[PDB]
Every structure is written in structure tokens, then in C-alpha cells.
Design a protein around this nucleic acid. Sequence first.
RNA 1: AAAUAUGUAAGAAGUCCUUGUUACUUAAUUGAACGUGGACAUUUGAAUGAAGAGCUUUUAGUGGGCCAUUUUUGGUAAGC
RNA 2: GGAAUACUGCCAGCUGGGACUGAGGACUGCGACGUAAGUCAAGGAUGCUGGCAUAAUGGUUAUAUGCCGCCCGUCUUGAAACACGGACCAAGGAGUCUAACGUCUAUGCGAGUGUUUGGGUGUAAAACCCAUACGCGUAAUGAAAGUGAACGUAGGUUGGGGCCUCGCAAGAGGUGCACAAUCGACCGAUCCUGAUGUCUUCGGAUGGAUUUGAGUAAGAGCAUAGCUGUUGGGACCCGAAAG
RNA 3: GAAAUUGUUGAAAGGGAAGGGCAUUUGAUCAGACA
Lengths: 51, 53, 156, 185, 222, 148
Amino acid sequence: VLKKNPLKNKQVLLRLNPYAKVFAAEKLGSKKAEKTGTKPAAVFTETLKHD
Amino acid sequence: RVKANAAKRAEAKAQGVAVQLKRQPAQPRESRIVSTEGNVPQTLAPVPYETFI
Amino acid sequence: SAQKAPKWYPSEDVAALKKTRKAARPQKLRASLVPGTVLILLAGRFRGKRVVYLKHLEDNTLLISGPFKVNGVPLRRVNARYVIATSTKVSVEGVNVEKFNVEYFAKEEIKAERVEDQKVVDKALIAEIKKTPLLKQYLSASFSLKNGDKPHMLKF
Amino acid sequence: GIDHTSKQHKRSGHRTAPKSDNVYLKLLVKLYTFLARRTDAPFNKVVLKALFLSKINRPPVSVSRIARALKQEGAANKTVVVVGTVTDDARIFEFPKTTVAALRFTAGARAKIVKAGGECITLDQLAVRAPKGQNTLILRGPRNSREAVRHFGMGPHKGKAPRILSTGRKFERARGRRRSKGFKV
Amino acid sequence: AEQVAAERAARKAANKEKRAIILERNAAYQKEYETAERNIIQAKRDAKAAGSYYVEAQHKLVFVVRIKGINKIPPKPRKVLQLLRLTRINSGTFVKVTKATLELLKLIEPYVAYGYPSYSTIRQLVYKRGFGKINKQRVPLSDNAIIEANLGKYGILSIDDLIHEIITVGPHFKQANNFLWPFKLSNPSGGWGVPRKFKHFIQGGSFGNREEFINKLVKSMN
Amino acid sequence: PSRFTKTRKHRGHVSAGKGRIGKHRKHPGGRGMAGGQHHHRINMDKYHPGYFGKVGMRYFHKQQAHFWKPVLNLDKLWTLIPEDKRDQYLKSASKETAPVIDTLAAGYGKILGKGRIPNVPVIVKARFVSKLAEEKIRAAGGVVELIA
RNA sequence: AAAUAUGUAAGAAGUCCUUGUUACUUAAUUGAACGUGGACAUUUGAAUGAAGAGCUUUUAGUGGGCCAUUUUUGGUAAGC
RNA sequence: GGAAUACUGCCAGCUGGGACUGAGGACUGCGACGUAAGUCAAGGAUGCUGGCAUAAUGGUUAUAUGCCGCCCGUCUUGAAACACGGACCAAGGAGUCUAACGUCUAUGCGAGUGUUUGGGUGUAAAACCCAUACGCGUAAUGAAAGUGAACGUAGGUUGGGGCCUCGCAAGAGGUGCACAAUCGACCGAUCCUGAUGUCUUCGGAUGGAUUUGAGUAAGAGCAUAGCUGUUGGGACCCGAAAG
RNA sequence: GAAAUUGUUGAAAGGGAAGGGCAUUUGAUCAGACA
Ligand SMILES: [Mg+2]
Ligand SMILES: [Mg+2]
Ligand SMILES: [Mg+2]
Ligand SMILES: [Mg+2]
Ligand SMILES: [Mg+2]
Ligand SMILES: [Mg+2]
Ligand SMILES: [Mg+2]
Ligand SMILES: [Mg+2]
Ligand SMILES: [Mg+2]
Ligand SMILES: [Mg+2]
Ligand SMILES: [Mg+2]
Ligand SMILES: [Mg+2]
Ligand SMILES: [Mg+2]
Ligand SMILES: [Mg+2]
Ligand SMILES: [Mg+2]
Ligand SMILES: [Mg+2]
Ligand SMILES: [Mg+2]
Ligand SMILES: [Mg+2]
Ligand SMILES: [Mg+2]
Ligand SMILES: [Mg+2]
Ligand SMILES: [Mg+2]
Ligand SMILES: [Mg+2]
Ligand SMILES: [Mg+2]
Ligand SMILES: [Mg+2]
Ligand SMILES: [Mg+2]
Ligand SMILES: [Mg+2]
Ligand SMILES: [Mg+2]
Ligand SMILES: [Mg+2]
Ligand SMILES: [Mg+2]
Ligand SMILES: [Mg+2]
Ligand SMILES: [Mg+2]
Ligand SMILES: [Mg+2]
């Protein structure tokens, strides 16, 4: 008789998608990016700034 | 398209599976990498007006 | 016959209310309400009277005394939404902690025992005001809005 | 606003009760309504719908069609069910013994049946003997053979029995029906 | 017989294990989505380092919301709009971007807004306005049981299972997507961002292919 | 009955269902069959072709009784025999003692054939018969006898 | 020689195999048409959508039109 | 070289204020939390407090204030129209009935159907009962003289609801009424063929066919009644100039 | 003993017509429950 919206009513967030808890626990909405460090070839950044 | 549709239907049911017998429409391009080596981009500006008549 | 006959009659029986699932929880009073805080009343006979907040009762109300020798305000209750908290507070130990609660107000022209519990918690707190200059006079005076006071910008 | 694509509030357009106020017939449908709901046997469904049908779609089925039905290989012993009425037929002599069920039964249809050892049961009788409609053979009278039907679709070149009240020469046979008088249909 | 204290636990074990099946599944997706986005990030970084340019795969899924009412529409766009289940101002259907639909878009471009929906909004869309079609009847989802009762045949048992079929345009995208009712969207909460809607997006308008911006527009209408 | 009739429902509607533009006038097409060859031609040449002109030859003072020959078919020959005598004549398919039925005294003038008989042979005395119907009652043993 | 519009096709009413019928056909069991039996269902043979499709009877009013964009003829033009 | 920040985006991160809503009425469902009992915000509002039980509240009415609102009926592409009718009220005032018809539905009976011209009879225009015929139907088709409906299990093919059998089942088979398409057969019209025969001109077997028919091919009608539609009638009502 | 229309009495309104719609104020008026 009344569609209850998930994204509010966190209870019904759990009736469907139980993995909702794991996401919140591991935060996982702000998963930190494993740093890497490759850098662009000169040709790339040379055409970029090119007139 | 059918005489060669059964010709597929034999070897694709002898040697294995995955018929894929109906056609499908053109598909959006898949990822690809294009090199600047030997093809370093040419930069382009629009043209001023002239008459040449 | 004047209306022949209504072939059906609604069943006079009363069918049971549905099993509700709305259970309680205590108020999360706003931070501004912490006991020993001076308050401005906006309603009742005691509109405007500045007052002292003492303890949050279990029917959501608040407990205040003027006190009586200051600005005539007995031990009474005020609703948590008809009052403002200010940025000035007083002390709370060195005065009674648990004497008063709801049924004290349910009565059954003055009443003489009441006059006593007044003075009881009165003087243990009239001690605290004298410690700060210009404070009984502040609490004795009522509260009013002067011309050009804009309450959305006025801090308390 | 909605760009509708089917026409709103359309009635399904099939009967859901006979236009009859026959108290017995309304009762007959009170039964098969229940049979069609709680048994999900096809025979019950195909019989509830046929109770609504107007006279023009419960055309008679004659003892002679029946007897020829009971000559399909596998039928001879079948409680045979006609949701219209059933009509005698003096053009057949041999008539097999059978138990047949129908709405109304004409005088001469009983004579050919009970005095061939057959049975003539109403349709609620046939319900108890075949609740799920087991071992039945539904027979239907010829619909597009009434008099009105030879007039439908009338038109040039469709050759379809004009609507006429007096037949014979001098009546709608001269011009546009032979080439000596103009043309033909 | 009794069969009363002989049944209950049989159902729940079939159930309680079904939910642990889902929870296994959604985590697979969670890694699947995040591995895939992180991989296209690094591919661009690699190609830039190589001296090459990584070019992403043309999107295979768009979201189309009809932004124009129902009167004064020529007969050919009027039909297409119906074939996409877009028959009422502010309603949405997904579409697999193929040629045979690329051309359907070109024909209705003056009347719809569309672009490339993010995972974030397919989630909110289906979580909020998701409704499926069971004998007509516009049924609200509200329980993966309803989804399994109509998509279990295809390997879709949960709601996030669906969302996966959509954005991955799985091999059963059609009957999954046709299961979904057209999303009855409201008008945008912050407005349209423009004086006049019925100019193309490139011209300071609102209709047509606005690519990744289709997500700002939809969440406000959502 | 009047109450069941649409004119009670049209009360309060100005045109009464007969139209504002074209109205319900007196005789917009001509009375009767008027115009059949002119402006109702289509509705006749179609729904009534052959309406115009003469086809036959005429018969002054044609009296219909002159041609009274009601037709009877082998398909129903045994209906002229009462049931109490159908019970015992159905057996005993005897060439001697055949059932003789006088169709003219029953009300017919010609016996045509269309629908097969049992081989119980019968004497039938009629005015006229079709070649085949005799050619099949003589195939059941019986004989057609002629009367007037 | 465009664009826009337009005919047809996208399978079980299918593809093929050994061979039966006739007065038509061929020099010819040659062919023609119609068949018994036999051999092949995920992706049944593009996309999208289907408050479901096919079909019948009867009968109303109507048979003065007008406007806008674009194409357009007569007219200098026109709320022609 | 190493940082910060903007922009953009995600978060099933946390959280403050305002507004409208409370439909449903024992229980059944999906969940969450729990070690269990059980508890929950999980298939729609409950709790505490206070005023009112008369004048809270609301209805009606007149007025006033805000914004809004041309005169209805009619023909018309277009009427508020400088188009027509209409000063006001009462009462009256227009698709009727009948003959014969189409379709549809209800009903009776059913290869039949129709008692009511007439007769009988009566508690007297009712009701009730009946003989013979007569109408339509059961046969068509030719201008007519005429002839007059089974090669077949009343046929073949394709489709077919239901029923039967095999199968836990998906399905497979068998039979298949109504209905539809098609190819045959049958009767009449037509045009050919023209045997046994014979009152030499009579008789017309047999076999046919880019021809034809309001046909047969295991009958469906007849009667009453209703709505609607049809034609003749004053014919929806009022209206000529004329004869 | 209706209506049109009219006299008297009473209430009310009225800056080149009057009447109507939604909403509310004022006035007038009708309403509202049992240990
Ligand atoms: Mg609406
Ligand atoms: Mg409408
Ligand atoms: Mg002539
Ligand atoms: Mg706003
Ligand atoms: Mg604007
Ligand atoms: Mg109307
Ligand atoms: Mg009409
Ligand atoms: Mg008129
Ligand atoms: Mg007219
Ligand atoms: Mg006209
Ligand atoms: Mg029909
Ligand atoms: Mg019509
Ligand atoms: Mg007409
Ligand atoms: Mg018409
Ligand atoms: Mg326009
Ligand atoms: Mg940010
Ligand atoms: Mg957030
Ligand atoms: Mg105005
Ligand atoms: Mg005019
Ligand atoms: Mg007007
Ligand atoms: Mg004017
Ligand atoms: Mg005039
Ligand atoms: Mg006048
Ligand atoms: Mg009157
Ligand atoms: Mg007759
Ligand atoms: Mg008149
Ligand atoms: Mg005169
Ligand atoms: Mg004259
Ligand atoms: Mg008097
Ligand atoms: Mg008066
Ligand atoms: Mg005055
Ligand atoms: Mg003046």
C-alpha cells in the first residue's frame, strides 16, 4: 500500500541488497586509490601546449 | 545467408557450442589505442575570408 | 410501507484496530538546552520573564524557577519550543538534584508545603548569581524587543 | 497528458452473463463459473463461455450429427455434450446407444435415444459424472448456415442472394444479372 | 497430518540461503564495476605515457527522457516515441546504442533529452522509481522476490542483478529493460538550466545528446 | 413501449439527434423508389441488380394450382409410415407384403431422390418421379407405381 | 543525379535426400506442378514495442470548411 | 622539485530548520537487530499534555475586499457582435401510431411452426378448449417445355477449440465439432459428345467444360416480443407563391 | 388562490447598469455529546 523509498528508510535498503552493510562497514564509498606514478610522454604534453 | 547458416550449424555443434545464428545491428566501437609515433598530430585553425573571383 | 426495505444493513459489529508499529523514543533535545541555562519565555503569563533551566522531566517538559524572590516565577514547567537559551550559564551542584517531578504539580488559595520547596532550592542558587556581577538585576528584568532588533542576526 | 495508443475504457466485448433472465440458466452458470475457476479443466472453461452465447450461436445439433460424431475412431463411448438444444432427425435409422447431455432436448431426440438405450442428462448431471470434464466430446451446430447469412456481404461479383421478398422471374433478374440486359453483377 | 511444524524452516533455508547468494553476487559486481573503471583509468595513463591516446569504447547504453508534451507532433516522431515507451512528458527509458536504435534517436532528437547514464543514477532511478510490468499492472519493485518471479528465467534474481544487466547491457538486456516500466520522472528540482528548452543542447537548449550531463538532469527530476 | 425509446433520451438536446447542419427535413431524396436510375443508381446496381427491365415471357391468367407438384425425397420416404407400424415393418424385409405408401394421399406430386433408404422394399405410388429415385428404389427391391 | 518519400525480403507457410501420381511438357522419367517417408528448435534465424490478435453484423452524424510552417500555381497584390 | 587549491564527479558518509499528508483497520509477507526470549522506523500514526461539550468548530445567507467573469438560443470556417429570435409570467407546445420490412437480443417449440377466419365454452370483448385447411420452412434451377441434389466412411489438403492415450514434467501422438482457405463430387442453366435402341424422326445412355445459378453436400425454421434502422402514410411541429 | 407585477413594514447595499465564480472578514442565522 505504500512504496517506501530506499536511500531513505535504511531498513528497506536491507530488504533488497544485503551487501548494503558491507559497503558501509568497509566505507567503500570512499575507497582510497592505490597510488601509481606513470607520467605522460613528451609528445603528449608537447601537442597539448602546442599553439 | 541460410545455406551458410547451417554450414555453421554443423561444425559449431560438432566441434562445440555458441551458435549465434541471428544477425545483429552495427555495434558501437570498442576501446582502442592510437599511436602518435610516425603520426604526430597536425594542428588546425579556421581560415580567413577571401574572394578569388 | 413507506420505504419498502433496504435489503442489506451494515454490520453493527466493531472490528479491531490494526496492530500498529509506532513505538516511542525519548526526545533528542536541542543542544542549547543544558541545565543551569538562562531562558526567555515567549508564552503564558510568564511571557518575557527570564528564568533558569534545571532538569528535563520525563513528559518532555522543562523545569524552571525564577526564582521567586527575584522575578516571581515559581517552580513550573515550560514547553521546549516556547523558549530561547542564552550563551550564559550557571552552576548546578550545590543545589538539589532530584526532589521534583511530574506529580508534584498535579494538585488535590495558596498551598503551604509548596512555598517551602521553593525556598529550599531557592537559596542554594541565589548563592550562584551573586558570584557574577549584574546578574540578579538581569534576571529580575523582563525581556522585550527594542526597535530595529533583528532576531535572525542577534546572538545570545 | 498521455499520447494513448489503445482506446481508453474499452470494454472487452464478450458476454459475461447470458442476456437471459432464466432463473434456471443463471443457476447453471452459477455452477460452471465455479467449475471453471477451481478445477482449471479446459472443458469447464469452454462450457462456461458457451452458456452466454445467444440463440444464433447455440444453433441446433441434431441426433444425426451426434451419431456421426460417435463414429470418429475413439468416441463411441463418450458422454457427449451440446450446450445448445438437440434436434431429432428422421433421415438416420441406426442410432447408437449413448449418454448425451444438452441444455434443452426436443421430443424426437429423446425417443431416438432412450429407446436406443441411451441416456439424456441435463448439464449439471454431466457435471457430477465428469467434474473435470473427463471423456467428453463437445459438438457445435452449423453457425454460418442460417437464412440471414446468405445475405451478408451482398455486392457486385460476390454473388450473394439479394435481399428480396418475392422471388422468381421479373424480380431482380434483368439488368446487371444477365448480359442481354446491360451487364452481369 | 500436521505439516505445520514441518514446513516453516524448509522455506527460510531456501530463502536465507537465497539472500546469501545475492550478497555473494553484489560483491562480485562491486569489484567488477570498480576493477573496470580503474582499468580504463590506467589505460589512459598508460597510453599517455606510451605517447599514444587511449580512446574509450563508444557507450552502448543511453537514457532517454521525453521533454516535450503530447500535442502537435508529426506522425513519424510520434510513432518512434511510442516504440520507446515515451508517451508522457518527463518519462524515461533506457536504450542499447546500436545502429538500428542510433537512427531511432536521430528521428526524435527535437523531443527528448538523453545521454550516458552513470551507475550512480541507474541505482537511484531503479531504487526510487523502479517498477516492473506484470500483466500490465505497473508493479513497484520493493522486493527482489518480484524480480526473481519474472527474471529468474534469465539469471536475474535481485535488484542489483538487474542494474547489472542494464549498465553492462547483458545478453538479456531487452527482456530485462522491457520489464521496467517507463520511469515516471518529475520536472527538475533545480529547473532546466536554460531559458528555452526546445533548442538543441549544443545551442544553449535542452534536447538531444548531452552525453554525460544526462545525470545532473535526471537526479533533479528523480 | 415509449419509455424504452431513444426520443425520451434526446429530450433537452436541441436537434434531437437528427443533426444541426443537415437537419431532418421532409423528403431530401424524393419519395419512395425515386431516382433509382438517376441518383440512387449505385444503391440499386449493387443490393438489387437485375431490378430494371424485363426478362421472361408473359403468362396471361397463370393459375398456380396447375403446377402444384410438392417435392419429396428418398431422404425422408419412410416418414409416411406410423411408428406403431414402423416398429414391426423395420424387421421382415419381405418382397411379399411390402409397405405401400400413397404419396399423393400424403400431399406430394413428384418424388425426387437425395438421401438413401434401408433395403426394406416398399411400393410407392406417386404422380411423377426422378429417374434416379426410381433407379434406387428398384435397387432396394421396391417399385414406383403411378397414379393421378 | 541527390535529400525526403516509395516496392520487396529477413525462415518451421523453412532447407535438403532416395522416389510415387497425370490426359500437361520433352528426343527422353526430360521437365512441370502436386505428394508418402526420411534428415535440422537456445542465438527460431536483425532492431523496437505490443491494456493481445483475427473476424463479422448493423447503424448514426457527415458529405459549406478554415488556419499555421514548408513545398506550390494564378494574380502587382490581397485578411485573394 | 614537492605540495595545496579550483572545477567536475561518487559516497548503501554524518547532521540542523520548514511544509503537505495519516489512506488502511485482528493475523498472514520481506527483512533488520538478537545468544535467546523477543525488540524494531521492517505489507499506510501513535503517544503525552491542554482548551471545548456551548456557541470550539462548521454549514447557509447578505454585505464588503482581492483577482476573475461580454448574452443566451441559432446558422456559421468564424457571434459579445453594428447577424436572427427573445419586454415579463403562467398554462399549453414538437420523431407519434399503423402496414410491410432489415439487423440484433430475449422466449416457445423445433423439420417442423403459427390456438384467437371460424367452432366450442365461459365467472362473458377476458380466460380456456378444438377440426379442416391456409402462410412460411423442408429444393433448387431455367425465359420456358422441363429436369431435379452421395465415386467416397457425404471425399481430399492446410489450420483448428475440446476430448483420448504415452509421460513427475517439457512435450509427443490420436481424434478433431464450429470456423476459415483450397481442390474435388453432386443437381439445374448452357455448349459439346450422341451408345442400346427406333412409329426416320422420335429417344438421349455414356462421357465431358478458361461457362453459369440467390443450390446439395447428416435440414433450421416458424411464431411472439423489444430496441434500433427502412418505405408508404398529415408522418417530428408550425410556414408558401399557387392548382 | 401560484407566477409575472404592486402597496406598506423590516434588514442591507449603491462615485457612468446590474447579476455570477473562487476565497475570507463582519452581521444575521442554523447546527454540535452520556459512569
Ligand atoms: Mg489525465
Ligand atoms: Mg476521448
Ligand atoms: Mg432490348
Ligand atoms: Mg525552487
Ligand atoms: Mg523558460
Ligand atoms: Mg450532444
Ligand atoms: Mg440520429
Ligand atoms: Mg437544427
Ligand atoms: Mg442530411
Ligand atoms: Mg450541407
Ligand atoms: Mg460472427
Ligand atoms: Mg454507417
Ligand atoms: Mg445518413
Ligand atoms: Mg454513412
Ligand atoms: Mg501549427
Ligand atoms: Mg566537491
Ligand atoms: Mg550524499
Ligand atoms: Mg476583467
Ligand atoms: Mg457568413
Ligand atoms: Mg452566440
Ligand atoms: Mg462588428
Ligand atoms: Mg434568417
Ligand atoms: Mg426583437
Ligand atoms: Mg409547460
Ligand atoms: Mg412452400
Ligand atoms: Mg406537418
Ligand atoms: Mg390558395
Ligand atoms: Mg399546375
Ligand atoms: Mg378566493
Ligand atoms: Mg409575487
Ligand atoms: Mg444608505
Ligand atoms: Mg450620475
